Design a protein around this ligand. Sequence first.
Ligand code: SAH
Lengths: 14, 216
Amino acid sequence: KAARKSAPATGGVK
Amino acid sequence: RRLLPFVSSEDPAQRLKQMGTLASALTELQMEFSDDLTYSSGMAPRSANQARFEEGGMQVLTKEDIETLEQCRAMCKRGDCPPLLVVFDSREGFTVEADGQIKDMTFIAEYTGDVDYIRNREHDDCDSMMTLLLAKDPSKSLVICPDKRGNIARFISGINNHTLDGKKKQNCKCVRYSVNGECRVFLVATRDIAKGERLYYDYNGYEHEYPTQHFV
Ligand SMILES: Nc1ncnc2c1ncn2[C@@H]1O[C@H](CSCC[C@H](N)C(=O)O)[C@@H](O)[C@H]1O
């Protein structure tokens, strides 16, 4: 059923 | 806020020991080391990885930050890896801990592995898939799959997103940046990390596709 980590593409680090 | 290069362990024996724990864990998963995104047959071609397809656009890595990225990459080629240890834990599996100090805003690693279409991995059991590109047309969305090839990033733990105090363990962050028009996934320290401190970031930093209720 597929588990996926995900990260934002905006907003920078801090 | 600018990306900082990591400081490798000064003792060459410590660096070889560090690199050995990573090679040991890759061997345990029958994986080949790979410090870059790879485009294999039957998966996605390098032409599919274009940041302009990202719905809502993708932040662009600045020339100053690209320079730092290139230094860290060059450091890893000659044997100056970041000060990290892959360590087995009975409740988490393989984990990554600092084997030296890592300052706030320090580049830790790129998330590498095979680039594939999300459409091609709807059934895949791999526990370490990481979104690369989220396109308006879902058949163009891409995911990094470090099941056959990858680096230390696939071993870093995530936080429990369900507990009242779980957020307190996060000491780094995963971000996606456009580099030369392509999507790239990087890990950066978000506070000063002490030697022996285990690394944790938020696996669900954009979508909520990773179950974490049972995480420690
Ligand atoms: N906080 C946490 N508590 C328990 N397990 C965790 C965890 N963070 C990550 N993991 C484990 O790591 C998996 C993500 S890939 C991370 C590397 C993995 N532990 C390994 O041995 O190769 C998760 O599915 C979970 O099994």
